[PDB]
């Protein structure tokens, strides 16, 4: 149980330099095996890079089959995944489904293609699909998905107006250019699909130059469209790029980790004390020292204490903000004003 958690921390949540050496070695062997998948299509190298890719794929199907079995066994140190239904819960998460598909399709291709051209056609796509293996616990995809979801209203706005300008401008250039002839003798903008391929290439600033408008009406519309409606496709890089940079700035004003230890302890035990109220024989009533009406009013006060503790645990996990300054000045000024009332009442009591 100790060594089980030790190898789970080596494979699944890696840290240090020994974990870095292992995962860098795995990333290099899958990238070298992709380079041989590139060289298998060049006619000079197609004989060599197939005879060294059939043997390299047998080593990697044994290696990643062994690593998947070790990782599936070693996922039992977590309390989520212990038991047979817990292992089936570990095989349900999406990176393990990708890893299982890669290893079992490699066995199918190497057993069917052992005794072959379409087997190579199936190898090359698995060589590509094995690149998803290096990002281990999905932190890359969760960081991107978090920033795309917060900024979803702005990304839908710029994609909608950019698409809308694409459709209207490609139609106006199709009308202005549908009779023009190229210098080679052919017709550039034959259909409306050709002008729409022009519009996609122009609005994203690629400009292959295979389709260029010829008449001065098409050049005038393309000049106004290219000046204005290109910014609506360069905006998602600006929105997400500044969204990442503001999130990194906000991570430096974090609260220190000890400031949530009393709030987390208080959340656990106010929630338990709300649970222990519904048993009338519990020893949780012995704090409040017969008890007919007091059962109900203790349950109301305990529910209020749970809601306050839940709010203060949520506030102890956020970064510092102006809301914290206004909240603690409200508490401090209220305690101090009550204290001057106490001094006032005692001065009026004794002297009068």
């Amino acid at each position: 149980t100790h060594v089980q958690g030790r190898v789970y921390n080596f494979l699944e949540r890696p840290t240090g330099w020994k974990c870095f050496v292992y995962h860098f070695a795995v990333f290099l062997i899958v990238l070298v095996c992709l380079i041989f998948s590139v060289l298998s299509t060049i006619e000079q190298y197609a004989a060599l890079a197939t005879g060294t890719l059939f043997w390299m794929e047998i080593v990697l199907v044994v290696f990643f089959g062994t690593e998947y079995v070790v990782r599936l066994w070693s996922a039992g140190c977590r309390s989520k995944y212990v038991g047979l239904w817990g292992r089936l819960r570990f095989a349900r998460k999406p990176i393990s489904i990708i890893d299982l598909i890669v290893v079992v399709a490699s066995m199918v291709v190497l057993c069917v293609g052992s005794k072959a051209t379409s087997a190579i056609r199936g190898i090359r796509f698995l060589q590509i699909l094995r690149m998803l293996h290096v990002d281990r616990q999905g932190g890359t995809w969760r960081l991107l998905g978090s920033v795309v979801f917060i900024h979803r209203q702005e990304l839908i706005t710029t994609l909608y107006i950019g698409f809308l300008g694409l459709i209207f401008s490609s139609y106006f250039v199709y009308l202005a250019e549908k009779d023009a002839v190229n210098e080679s003798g052919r017709v550039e903008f034959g259909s409306y699909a050709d002008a729409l391929w022009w519009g996609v290439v122009t609005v994203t600033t690629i400009g292959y130059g295979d389709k260029v408008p010829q008449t001065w009406v098409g050049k005038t519309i393309a000049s106004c469209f290219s000046v204005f409606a290109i910014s609506f496709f360069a905006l998602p890089a600006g929105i997400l790029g500044s969204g990442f940079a503001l999130k990194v700035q906000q991570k430096q004003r974090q609260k220190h980790f000890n400031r949530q230890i009393p709030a987390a302890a208080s959340l656990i035990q106010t929630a338990w004390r709300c649970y222990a109220a519904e048993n009338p024989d519990s020893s949780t009533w012995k704090i409040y020292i017969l008890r007919e009406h007091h059962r109900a009013t203790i349950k109301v006060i305990r529910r209020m204490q749970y809601f306050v503790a839940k709010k203060k645990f949520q506030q102890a996990r956020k970064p510092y903000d102006v809301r914290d300054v206004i909240e603690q000045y409200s508490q401090g000024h209220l305690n101090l004003m009550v204290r001057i009332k106490e001094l006032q009442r005692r001065l009026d009591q004794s002297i009068g």
Binding site: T1, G5, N9, C77, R78, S79, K80, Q260, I261, P262, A263, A264, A265, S266, L267, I268, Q269, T270, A271, W272, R273, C274, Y275, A276, S282, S283, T284, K286, I287, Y288, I289, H293, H294, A296, T297, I298, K299, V300, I301, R303, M304, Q305, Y306, F307, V308, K310, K311, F313, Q314, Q331, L334, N335, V338
Partner: protein, 144 residues
């Protein structure tokens, strides 16, 4: 729900003690001091600001019934208690030590009576190397 609102009007009358229909911080403070609790003024204000939705500073009766309606066995509240245990969790596997949980429950935050913690520990299977699965607690105290 008519027996429920009968009980909730019954419980609201123990705090009101006149015909206002509102609960003041003083009007709650006398009830807590009659139980021998002695809360602070900002504690009473923090209790009442989590109940009202009108901002005026007192708890009317529909606000009281909205507090008693909403359920502890929640989608979010289960995740808050599960996230609260993970602060006290070394290596994050889903197990905390027995004497570590007794040290946390009797010292940090609101300090618990030692008989309560002796009940809290024996609610879960504590043996097996001294480890306890705190998700058994989270399912237990959100079974309601």
């Amino acid at each position: 729900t008519e027996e429920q609102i009968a009980e909730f009007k019954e419980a609201f009358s123990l705090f009101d003690k006149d015909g206002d229909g509102t609960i003041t911080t003083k009007e709650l403070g006398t009830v807590m001091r009659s139980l021998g609790q002695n809360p602070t003024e900002a504690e009473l204000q923090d209790m009442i600001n989590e109940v009202d939705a009108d901002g005026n500073g007192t708890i009317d009766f529909p606000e009281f019934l909205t507090m008693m309606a909403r359920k502890m066995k929640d989608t979010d509240s289960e995740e808050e208690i599960r996230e609260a245990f993970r602060v006290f969790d070394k290596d994050g596997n889903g197990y905390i030590s027995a004497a570590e949980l007794r040290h946390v429950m009797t010292n940090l935050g609101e300090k618990l009576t030692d008989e309560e913690v002796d009940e809290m520990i024996r609610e879960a299977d504590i043996d097996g190397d001294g480890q306890v699965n705190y998700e058994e607690f989270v399912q237990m105290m959100t079974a309601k």
